[PDB]
Amino acid sequence: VSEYELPEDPRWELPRDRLVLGKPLGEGAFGQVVLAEAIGLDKDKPNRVTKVAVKMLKSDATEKDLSDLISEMEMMKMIGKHKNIINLLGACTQDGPLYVIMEYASKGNLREYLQARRPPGLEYSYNPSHNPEEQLSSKDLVSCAYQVARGMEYLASKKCIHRDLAARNVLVTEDNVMKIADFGLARDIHHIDYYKKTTNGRLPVKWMAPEALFDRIYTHQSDVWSFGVLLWEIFTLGGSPYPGVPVEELFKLLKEGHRMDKPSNCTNELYMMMRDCWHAVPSQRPTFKQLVEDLDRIVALTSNQ
């Protein structure tokens, strides 16, 4: 790593020995995220400990992988802070491997968070968690969507196109705050494999707008399409999109104006929002600003009983 000039930034630099490294949080090619305790992250509270997520490259990482990680870090700096995104907290760039320090979401990703809170009724697939948690009220689910819309509205205003908005990329903090993750990732410069499964075997094509899918055109409006799919994931408490539809087929279906059916427990108004997000013509989908305003009103009218 000493072969490279790493961008040191005194506003963000944290001495390596101020991090007590803990358990893995995840792993995906290059590279890995570990839980850590950071001593004196806030310079004015030097004896405070903060739980953080520490992102680093794998042992097999390449010059491009390092460039990607740096790029994510610099992008997060430029995008700035928001309550509903995974924020940058600091970095270790001198005396060892690049560490990018980010906010820690202790309750994991939204898909697994919702699946562990599935009640036993007819209205959801079965709860797969060995440690089931308290069911969420109706208000809570809409509020979940509100917060994600809020985060995306902020990101869109900073001219950040996410390109893979999905429940798996929303994280939940100890206080049940929704935080959009992986918004700063570098765009792959090689073409896409529409059948590649992620490191948890998810098929990303099921969240892509048709123009992203067929033409690789990504905009804020294709992100709005993804948000529609995420809304569907929410009101299925973590369901898998287009159940039983294989990829090669998804191409054809979307073309014919095929859309997912309304989840069993979903209001007509929330289902219309989904359908609006899945308008065939990008210019005709709502914007994140409209979505934030609509969902704000809907949260107020929705019951937590």
Curated annotation (Swiss-Prot):
Annotated positions of the Phosphotyrosine modification: 4, 124, 126, 194-195, 271
Protein name: Fibroblast growth factor receptor 1
Subunit relationships: Monomer. Homodimer after ligand binding. Interacts predominantly with FGF1 and FGF2, but can also interact with FGF3, FGF4, FGF5, FGF6, FGF8, FGF10, FGF19, FGF21, FGF22 and FGF23 (in vitro). Ligand specificity is determined by tissue-specific expression of isoforms, and differences in the third Ig-like domain are crucial for ligand specificity. Affinity for fibroblast growth factors (FGFs) is increased by heparan sulfate glycosaminoglycans that function as coreceptors. Likewise, KLB increases the affinity for FGF19, FGF21 and FGF23.
Record family assignment: Belongs to the protein kinase superfamily. Tyr protein kinase family. Fibroblast growth factor receptor subfamily.
Part of the whole protein covered: 460 to 764 of 822
Protein kinase domain ranges (all copies): 19-305
Result when mutating residue 207 to R: In HH2; with cleft palate
Tissue expression per record: Detected in astrocytoma, neuroblastoma and adrenal cortex cell lines. Some isoforms are detected in foreskin fibroblast cell lines, however isoform 17, isoform 18 and isoform 19 are not detected in these cells.
Free-text comment on this protein's domains from its UniProt entry: The second and third Ig-like domains directly interact with fibroblast growth factors (FGF) and heparan sulfate proteoglycans. Isoforms lacking the first Ig-like domain have higher affinity for fibroblast growth factors (FGF) and heparan sulfate proteoglycans than isoforms with all three Ig-like domains.
Species of provenance: Homo sapiens (Human)
Binding-site residues, ATP: 25-31, 55, 103-105, 109, 168, 182
Task of the protein: Tyrosine-protein kinase that acts as a cell-surface receptor for fibroblast growth factors and plays an essential role in the regulation of embryonic development, cell proliferation, differentiation and migration. Required for normal mesoderm patterning and correct axial organization during embryonic development, normal skeletogenesis and normal development of the gonadotropin-releasing hormone (GnRH) neuronal system. Phosphorylates PLCG1, FRS2, GAB1 and SHB. Ligand binding leads to the activation of several signaling cascades.
